[PDB]
Design a protein around this ligand. Structure first.
Ligand SMILES: CCCCCCCCCCCCCCCCCC(=O)OC[C@H](CO[C@@H]1O[C@H](CO[C@H]2O[C@H](CO)[C@H](O)[C@H](O)[C@H]2O)[C@H](O)[C@H](O)[C@H]1O)OC(=O)CCCCCCCCCCCCCCCCC
Ligand code: CLA
Ligand code: CLA
Ligand code: CLA
Ligand SMILES: CCCCCCCCCCCCCCCCCC(=O)OC[C@H](CO[C@@H]1O[C@H](CO)[C@H](O)[C@H](O)[C@H]1O)OC(=O)CCCCCCCCCCCCCCCCC
Ligand SMILES: CCCCCCCCCCCCCCCC(=O)OC[C@H](CO[C@@H]1O[C@H](CS(=O)(=O)O)[C@@H](O)[C@H](O)[C@H]1O)OC(=O)CCCCCCCCCCCCCCC
Ligand SMILES: CCCCCCCCCCCCCCCC(=O)OC[C@H](CO[C@@H]1O[C@H](CS(=O)(=O)O)[C@@H](O)[C@H](O)[C@H]1O)OC(=O)CCCCCCCCCCCCCCC
Ligand SMILES: CCCCCCCCCCCCCCCC(=O)OC[C@H](COP(=O)(O)OC[C@@H](O)CO)OC(=O)CCCCCCCCCCCCCCC
Ligand SMILES: CC1=C(/C=C/C(C)=C/C=C/C(C)=C/C=C/C=C(C)/C=C/C=C(C)/C=C/C2=C(C)CCCC2(C)C)C(C)(C)CCC1
Ligand SMILES: CC1=C(/C=C/C(C)=C/C=C/C(C)=C/C=C/C=C(C)/C=C/C=C(C)/C=C/C2=C(C)CCCC2(C)C)C(C)(C)CCC1
Ligand SMILES: CC1=C(/C=C/C(C)=C\C=C/C(C)=C/C=C/C=C(C)/C=C/C=C(C)\C=C\C2=C(C)CCCC2(C)C)C(C)(C)CCC1
Ligand SMILES: CCCCCCCCCCCCO[C@@H]1O[C@H](CO)[C@@H](O[C@H]2O[C@H](CO)[C@@H](O)[C@H](O)[C@H]2O)[C@H](O)[C@H]1O
Ligand SMILES: [Ca+2]
Ligand SMILES: [Fe+2]
Lengths: 39, 63, 39, 341, 78, 30, 31, 35, 38, 506, 34, 31, 39, 30
């Protein structure tokens, strides 16, 4: 992004960490909705 | 090293120390026999396990 | 036949730290297993 | 160049993931065991073996999923996919709990392959194989717990299920049915594991607080290089500290590290011997002197007799649900319970 | 230090890598999604859907008791 | 009479602790 | 208490036999 | 310079990561299954 | 000659043909191709 | 000097003293066998083979003497219950005496080998130092093993010259030592067929003779010699410990699951016979056969043998003991005197009730009575405030058929509850609890103790194999690593791990 | 089964996109190792 | 026989304690 | 205060003949007194 | 069980006799 042919690794890391936090938050959301929510 | 009569009798059985066949020798025949032994062990295990059921008998105290 | 000296004889040592460690191990094994020996 | 030696060259290259001759046993077996566990905890029920939901597909969470043990009706059947139970049907094999011997067997052979990998890399690097000798402890635990305990029992059903709450069930089951806390072999296991944790913590703290001033930064981690010859921390200062704090101290680095090896490995081996005993229901369940007294004297109560009562209550309230193949109908009036609860 | 392979920090900071993965990783995600959402996972693994834990003729736990004829046992359990 | 045996084995461990502290082999720099 | 009749002899021998072995080995060390 | 692309390390990464992302997408769809 | 015997024999054959034999050929092939230069 | 855990290394490179230590171990094992048999003979009760057999009395080595053909004593009793037989010298006492005398002879031979360690046989004529040709020794010992195995299968087991081995009926009522013919079909791999054991020893002995002849005439390959370190005797120790724990796992399994070689008259019934109701099913089959013949319940139940009912008792299951519940099974429930007969429990409405039996897992078990269609009709409640199915309310009476209590009916609820708790343990028996001061908690049988010892020893011998195998293959670095070892352990320098000629130089 | 088609087809799209974006260097690496 | 309950432990200790003392002294001799 | 070495330390010996004599004396004392210990 | 104790103590004396004859310190003229 600020280089030639290259992406900064911290941008890649923040994107991957945001995706990992998102799928963890989705898995925690599914504890309160749908199956296994006791309702 | 003290000579005995029994030692002199048994001496040719302990005279070939470190003698080898050069190269691989009979290692492939060995490996074939180990494969057959493994298959035999598998057979008798699966018979005792009742995972291999053969006609003519049952694995039970009455046979 | 003659009774010759063996040259493979080698002394055994147990130092004081090893003695203390063994004595403590034996004491705590007795402490652990005495209740089960008595039952 | 012989084909064996050419293959030996290729298997033992310096790559990112070392393969070796042991890798041919390790990697397919470890992959099979791990993929079987992930597959079972994601998709496979325990409804026909246990009357339970144990996959993410059924709504269980990471704590409540398991590759559960197979049905008690199969005994110690190895439950091959081609075996006389499943008869080649993958769906039937999943439903009867065949993923449990799949995971357990491939896992056991993968553990074999891993200790063989330890031996192979230790030989290639040129070091002693004490990592493999230390790993004998975990394999002793796995063999005694996941293999010889169900083999001594009636079926694979009573093996621990490959899950978090399933392992917690196995743990509580062994308390209530075997009095496994009272077993001295488990006490030696506990002593070994807590001593290993103590030694790890104390050894790390001692080294980090006896470090030599070998750099100008407050960050002490950059005052070390791996190729240096001298010690990075003061064994003399550490020895004087622990001699005056605790009374004794290590004076030998090699003995210290052998002891750090020795304590948890010996604990694992001792707990394994106890689990082998428990496989045949050879428990340290009771102190017969105290029961004879308690049966004769109703004034005699210890913490041991209270634990005995706890075990009876757990057994009676858990066994109809934990062993549904037995069809244990315990009416409510036979359940042991104290006053008002 | 380097055993021969391309370093990972070089690989994942490339345009061509993310051109390939911007496609491969989400489409593996949707492959798992369509495995679950089309209901194929239930048929593949024999997991009951939320209305086949109990049928109208069986309201107890379908604990297998057969040792060899389990296919017919699961069938009559449904 | 088992109480005597328990007291003896606990006393043996505590005596070992005293003699290991008070009469250790001294660590010597050499 | 109704204990095992062999519990005392087993406890004393279990303690005392390896204690004796260790004392034998320590005292002869340096010979 | 001029590294290989397909290695034992490449296969070691995918053997794990391709079914990992497949399974993660599966469990994500599981989050929306109603009772 | 039982179904379980036939299934065991087919397991021997298919564990060779799925796991052991194609891994043996693949290892021999890739070791002969990517040789170490001394 | 040597640390304590290494003291026995002194005989590592001393074949004479190694042979001497082996003799001393062999003498100690044979003397243990003799002295253990003598102690067992001194405390054995031969008065009743039915309800006080060897496996109720803690007899460990006596079943192993009985298995291969030694059933009688010099005193005049036999373990099959027969009397007046003449065993010759090879009674239990004669076998024990032969092991004591063999132990003394092996002790003296160990003394001789310890003292005259420097025999000319043990040194190499080519070099000047002690050398054992371990592949050749293996070939001789293998050939001897094959000859002995073949002779034991073909003469001793078959009874061609020998007693045979112990066989029984499937329910362990008619066990005796007989010649056994070899079974050469697939039923020879049935573990409960003794003819399979006979064929095994004949065929495995022939194969061992052939293998010994090969291992006697053909030198090892150089690759296998160097790979397995065949000049080191520790590689023999490692592989032998491996084979030994293999065989120990096998014998623990065959002891626990039952085998032709682990008959229930010698070691006790198995836990799986209690688990699946094996003896109870046979007892019910015999009773139903007599009922179909046209007999009454008392007549049908009075022809169940007391031995068969004694097998159908959870206190004879080996999975009811404790690790520190020491000794004989008679130290637990007591010495069995007599079968009390089979109870039939009937409630006040005439339904037949069956007490749910105690499984092997449970130290305690609730008393539950269910009818024919699996509905609980009576129990012994814990809380009586909301009790509905107590024995008192349901009017449960119990009638005993066969045994000591034959023809009797108990309707007093205390007696009925006592008999319900007895029926929970299977077939009820009267016990003498004063002879050994029996404390009331179940012990395990010699089957269980054998399985426990051998399983634990097989597990520990797995560590021995790893230890000695590692000491074998890493003998060069036992004192430590090389004082260099710098450049070969760096990453990426060499194409192959540990190979100097594979330097990339890049 | 349409379920098998719609499950396998995302894997096919991923594989063919990876192939048409890596295949030149893939064939080159295959050539250089013979 | 109705023997003293402490007879076995007294006999074993009466034999074994000075046996141990003698073995300790003999094995360390020459140090 | 300082911990000085004591010069009055002297080694103890028990020869093999003395060991055999003591072991025999202890064995025959056990043989003599065991019947009275059991009573 | 006292018979075991009697046998052990008699056996200890007889073993001492054997080891004192067979493994005596040899008398040496010097
Ligand atoms: C070291 C590290 C390396 C790690 C390696 C890990 C990989 C190992 C690969 C092997 C795995 C072992 C599988 C064992 C299968 C088994 O055991 O399967 C069990 C079978 C026996 O089957 C069982 O037999 C029992 C008794 O049945 C008998 O009795 C019944 C009731 O009377 C019926 O009559 C029945 O018909 C009759 O056969 C019950 O029927 C059980 O339900 C049935 O499962 O034995 C058999 O196949 C073979 C028995 C002999 C060999 C035993 C080897 C294992 C040792 C076990 C020790 C056992 C107990 C000690 C525990 C501690
Ligand atoms: C000729 C001498 C001789 C004879 C006739 C006996 C006879 C007997 N012994 Mg004794 N014994 C002897 C010597 C002898 N012994 C010696 C020298 C020792 C010291 C090691 C012992 C130590 C001993 C003990 C501890 C016990 C006996 C017991 C017994 C009794 C039952 C044995 C049994 O269960 O078989 C079991 C034997 C085996 C299962 C053989 C195992 C061999 C394995 C399977 C082979 C290993 C693999 C092989 C090397 C390689 C494959 C070979 C193949 C290719 C051909 C029996 C009366 C028992 C007893 O009743 O006590 C009184 C018992 O507890 N003996
Ligand atoms: C493995 C071989 C073996 C087996 C299976 C048996 C089995 C049996 N024996 Mg026997 N015995 C044996 C060897 C064996 N014995 C030996 C070698 C001797 C000579 C000492 C004897 C002498 C003997 C006598 C005198 C008697 C028996 C009796 C019995 C029966 C009752 C069991 C019992 O109470 O023990 C209980 C077992 C335990 C309490 C378990 C002990 C385990 C120890 C304490 C664990 C140690 C932990 C360790 C130190 C910690 C490690 C530390 C770590 C850092 C490394 C039983 C069938 C009795 C019988 O019924 O006679 C007819 C009887 O009175 N045996
Ligand atoms: C037949 C099997 C066998 C044989 C011949 C050996 C032989 C040897 N071992 Mg090995 N080993 C074995 C099995 C065996 N081992 C097993 C099963 C294990 C796992 C527990 C080990 C683990 C092991 C280790 C960690 C070491 C050895 C070492 C040694 C060497 C020196 C032994 C010594 O002086 O210790 C002397 C022992 C004592 C002074 C006291 C030990 C007393 C024990 C704890 C209890 C007494 C047992 C009782 C009397 C008999 C019952 C045992 C029986 C049931 C098996 C020697 C070559 C050492 C070595 O490698 O040297 C370089 C070494 O460090 N072994
Ligand atoms: C000097 C040299 C000799 C040294 C001896 C050192 C002794 C140490 C103390 C003994 C320790 C064991 C005591 C057991 C308790 C006891 O008193 O039992 C007492 C029991 C005797 O049991 C008695 O039996 C009688 C009938 O004969 C009656 O039934 C009595 O009621 C009963 O008490 O002793 C034994 O049975 C010895 C056998 C023990 C071993 C059998 C199982 C073998 C498997 C072992 C597995 C070990 C694993 C370890 C792994 C690591
Ligand atoms: C999970 C994946 C599976 C992993 C598989 C790993 C690859 C296989 C590893 C095999 C290791 C053992 C072979 C070692 C080489 C050797 O011994 O032979 C050396 C010879 C000649 O090599 C040449 O011979 C030359 C001469 S000489 O033989 O040494 O005399 C020599 O100079 C030269 O160096 C040498 O190359 O090579 C051969 O081709 C022999 C092939 C057979 C080897 C044993 C295999 C038997 C398996 C049993 C299964 C069949 C039975 C089925 C029953 C139902
Ligand atoms: C695809 C196969 C990848 C897995 C494998 O086993 O690698 C085996 C090797 C790949 O790694 C090869 O192997 C070597 C590295 S390593 O062994 O993979 O670690 C390396 O030297 C070589 O350049 C590399 O091509 O096979 C190839 O050379 C095939 C070329 C790959 C292009 C087509 C895909
Ligand atoms: C900022 C995080 C601080 C949290 C405290 C935990 C770290 C300290 C714990 C060590 C206890 C043992 C004490 C002796 C050990 C000892 O003496 O340590 C010595 C070690 C050496 O540090 P230096 O002296 O070089 O630098 C530390 C200071 O002196 C100045 O930087 O100290 C540290 O490394 C501190 C670094 C902590 C900062 C990051 C750590 C994050 C870990 C926790 C993360 C969360 C964990 C749970 C998640 C699931
Ligand atoms: C069974 C079987 C088999 C096998 C299979 C396999 C082998 C597979 C697989 C598989 C796999 C292999 C899968 C996977 C997976 C995965 C997953 C499911 C994941 C996950 C995860 C997560 C969720 C994470 C998270 C996190 C954390 C927590 C930490 C950090 C952060 C993060 C976020 C990352 C076969 C076919 C042969 C046959 C039949 C049987
Ligand atoms: C000199 C002589 C003689 C004699 C001989 C004899 C008399 C003998 C013997 C012998 C004997 C009499 C022996 C023995 C033995 C024993 C043993 C060898 C043992 C043991 C032990 C053990 C090893 C155990 C252990 C244990 C314990 C204690 C606890 C539990 C666990 C166990 C098991 C580990 C005659 C004159 C004839 C001839 C000439 C010479
Ligand atoms: C750890 C890690 C990582 C990752 C990370 C991530 C994945 C993330 C994050 C993060 C993020 C992603 C963030 C953020 C942020 C934001 C903020 C912090 C903000 C704010 C603000 C505010 C305060 C707000 C306000 C307001 C209100 C209050 C209302 C009105 C409107 C508004 C909205 C304005 C990396 C690779 C790098 C490195 C290594 C490791
Ligand atoms: C993450 C891993 C994915 C798991 C794999 C997904 C597929 C799982 C299996 C579903 C496929 C079809 O499901 C089931 O397959 C089995 C094969 O095992 C078929 O079984 C058929 O072939 C087998 C093999 O000879 C024999 O049992 C028999 O001839 C017949 O039943 C069944 O008829 C079908 O109902
Ligand atoms: Ca009420
Ligand atoms: Fe350290």
């Amino acid at each position: 992004m600020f280089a030639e042919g290259r992406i900064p690794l911290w941008v890649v890391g923040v994107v991957a960490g945001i995706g990992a936090i998102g799928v963890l938050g989705l898995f925690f959301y599914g504890a309160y909705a749908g199956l296994g929510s006791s309702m | 090293a003290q000579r005995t009569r029994l030692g002199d009798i048994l001496r040719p059985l302990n005279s070939e120390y470190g003698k080898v066949v050069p190269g691989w020798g009979t290692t492939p025949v060995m490996g074939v026999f180990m494969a057959l032994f493994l298959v035999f062990l598998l057979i008798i295990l699966q018979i005792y396990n009742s995972s291999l059921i053969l006609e003519g008998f049952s694995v039970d105290w009455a046979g | 036949m003659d009774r010759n000296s063996n040259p493979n004889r080698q002394p055994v040592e147990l130092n004081r730290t090893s003695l203390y460690l063994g004595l403590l191990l034996v004491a705590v094994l007795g402490i652990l297993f005495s209740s089960y020996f008595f039952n | 160049r012989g084909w064996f030696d050419v293959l030996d060259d290729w298997l033992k290259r310096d790559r990112f993931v070392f393969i070796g001759w042991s890798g041919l046993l390790l990697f397919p077996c470890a992959f099979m065991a791990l993929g079987g566990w992930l597959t079972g905890t994601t998709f496979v029920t325990s409804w026909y073996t246990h009357g339970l939901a144990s996959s993410y597909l059924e709504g269980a969470n990471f704590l409540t999923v398991a590759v559960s043990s197979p049905a008690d009706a199969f005994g110690h059947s190895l439950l091959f996919l081609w075996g006389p139970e499943a008869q080649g049907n993958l769906t039937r094999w999943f439903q009867i709990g065949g993923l449990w011997p799949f995971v357990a067997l491939h896992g056991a052979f993968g553990l074999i392959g891993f200790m063989l990998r330890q031996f192979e890399i230790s030989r290639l690097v040129g070091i002693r194989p004490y990592n493999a000798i230390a790993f004998s402890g975990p394999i002793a635990v796995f063999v005694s717990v996941f293999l010889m305990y169900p083999l001594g029992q009636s079926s694979w059903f009573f093996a621990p299920s490959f899950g978090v709450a399933g392992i917690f069930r196995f743990i509580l089951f062994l308390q209530g049915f075997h009095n496994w806390t009272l077993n001295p072999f488990h006490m030696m296991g506990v002593a070994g594991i807590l001593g290993g944790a103590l030694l790890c913590a104390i050894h790390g703290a001692t080294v980090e607080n006896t470090l030599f001033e070998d750099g100008e930064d407050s960050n002490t981690f950059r005052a070390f290089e791996p190729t240096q010859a001298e010690e990075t921390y003061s064994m003399v200062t550490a020895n004087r500290f622990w001699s005056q704090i605790f009374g004794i101290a290590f004076s030998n680095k090699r003995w210290l590290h052998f002891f750090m090896l020795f304590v948890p490995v010996t604990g694992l081996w001792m707990s394994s011997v106890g689990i082998v005993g428990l496989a045949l229901n050879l428990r340290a369940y009771d102190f017969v002197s105290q029961e004879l007294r308690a049966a004769e004297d109703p004034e005699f109560e210890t913490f041991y007799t209270k634990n005995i009562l706890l075990n009876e209550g757990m057994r009676a309230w858990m066994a109809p649900q934990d062993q549904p193949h037995e069809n244990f109908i315990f009416p409510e009036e036979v359940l042991p319970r104290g006053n008002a609860l | 230090g380097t055993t021969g392979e391309r370093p990972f920090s070089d690989i994942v900071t490339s345009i061509r890598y993310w051109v390939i993965h911007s496609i491969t990783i989400p489409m593996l995600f949707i492959a798992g999604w369509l495995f679950v959402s089309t209901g194929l996972a239930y048929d593949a693994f024999g997991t009951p859907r939320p209305d086949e834990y109990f049928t109208q003729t069986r309201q107890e736990l379908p604990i297998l008791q057969e040792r060899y004829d389990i296919n017919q046992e699961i069938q009559e359990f449904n | 009479m088992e109480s005597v045996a328990y007291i003896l084995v606990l006393t043996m461990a505590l005596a070992v602790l005293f003699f290991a502290i008070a009469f250790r082999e001294p660590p010597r720099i050499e | 208490m109704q204990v095992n009749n062999l519990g005392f002899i087993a406890s004393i021998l279990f303690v005392l036999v390896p204690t004796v072995f260790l004392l034998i080995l320590f005292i002869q060390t340096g010979k | 310079v001029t590294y290989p692309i397909f290695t034992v390390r490449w296969l070691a990464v995918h053997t794990l990561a391709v079914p990992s992302v497949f399974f993660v997408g599966a469990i994500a769809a599981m989050q929306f299954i109603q009772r | 000659m039982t179904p379980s015997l036939a299934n065991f024999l087919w397991s021997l054959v298919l564990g060779a043909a799925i796991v052991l034999i194609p891994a043996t050929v693949g290892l021999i092939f890739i070791s002969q191709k990517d040789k170490i230069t001394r | 000097g040597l640390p304590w855990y290494r003291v026995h290394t002194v005989v590592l490179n001393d074949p004479g003293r190694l042979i001497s230590v082996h003799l001393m171990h062999t003498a100690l094992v044979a003397g243990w066998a003799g002295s253990m048999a003598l102690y067992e003979l001194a405390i054995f009760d031969s008065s009743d083979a039915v309800l006080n057999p060897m496996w109720r009395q803690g007899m460990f080595v006596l079943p192993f003497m009985a298995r291969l053909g030694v059933t009688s004593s010099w005193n005049g009793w036999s373990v099959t219950g027969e009397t007046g037989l003449d065993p010759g010298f090879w009674s239990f006492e004669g076998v024990a005496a032969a092991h004591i005398v063999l132990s003394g002879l092996l002790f003296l031979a160990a003394v001789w080998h310890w003292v005259f360690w420097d025999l000319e046989l043990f040194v190499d004529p080519r070099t000047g130092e002690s050398a054992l040709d371990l592949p050749k020794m293996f070939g001789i010992h293998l050939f001897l093993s094959g000859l002995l195995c073949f002779g034991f299968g073909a003469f001793h087991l078959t009874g061609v010259w020998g007693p045979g081995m112990w066989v029984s009926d499937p329910y362990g009522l008619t066990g005796h030592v007989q010649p056994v013919a070899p079974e050469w079909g697939p039923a020879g791999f049935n573990p409960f067929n003794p003819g399979g054991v006979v064929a095994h020893h004949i065929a495995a002995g022939i194969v061992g003779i052939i293998a010994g002849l090969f291992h006697l005439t053909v030198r090892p390959p150089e690759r296998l010699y160097k790979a397995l370190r065949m000049g080191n005797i520790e590689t023999v120790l490692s592989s032998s410990i491996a084979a030994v724990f293999f065989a120990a796992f096998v014998v623990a399994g065959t002891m626990w699951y039952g085998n032709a070689t682990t008959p229930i008259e010698l070691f006790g019934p198995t836990r799986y016979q209690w688990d699946k109701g094996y003896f109870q099913e046979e007892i019910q089959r015999r009773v139903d056969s007599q009922l179909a013949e046209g007999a009454s319940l008392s007549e049908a139940w009075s022809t169940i043998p007391e031995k068969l009912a004694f097998y159908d008792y959870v206190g004879n299951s080996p999975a009811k003991g404790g690790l520190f519940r020491t000794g004989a099974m008679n130290s637990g429930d007591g010495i069995a005197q007599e079968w009390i007969g089979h109870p039939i429990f009937k409630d006040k409405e005439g339904r037949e009730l069956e007490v749910r039996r105690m499984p092997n897992f449970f130290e305690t078990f609730p008393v539950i009575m269910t009818d024919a269609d699996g509905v609980v009709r009576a129990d012994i409640p814990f809380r009586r405030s909301e009790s509905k199915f107590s024995v008192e309310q349901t009017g449960v009476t119990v009638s005993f058929y066969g045994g000591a209590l034959d023809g009797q009916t108990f309707s007093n609820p205390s007696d009925v509850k006592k008999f319900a708790r007895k029926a929970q343990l299977g077939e009820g028996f009267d016990f003498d609890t004063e002879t050994f001061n029996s404390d009331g908690v179940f012990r395990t049988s010699p089957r269980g103790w054998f399985t426990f010892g051998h399983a634990v020893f097989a597990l520990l011998f797995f560590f021995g194999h790893i230890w000695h195998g590692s000491r074998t293959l890493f003998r060069d670095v036992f004192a430590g690593v090389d004082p260099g070892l710098e450049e070969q352990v760096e990453f990426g320098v060499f194409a192959k791990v540990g190979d100097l000629s594979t330097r990339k130089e890049a | 089964d349409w379920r098998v088609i719609v499950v396998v087809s995302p894997l096919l799209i991923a594989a063919t996109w990876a192939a048409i974006n890596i295949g030149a260097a893939a064939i080159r690496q295959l050539q250089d190792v013979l």
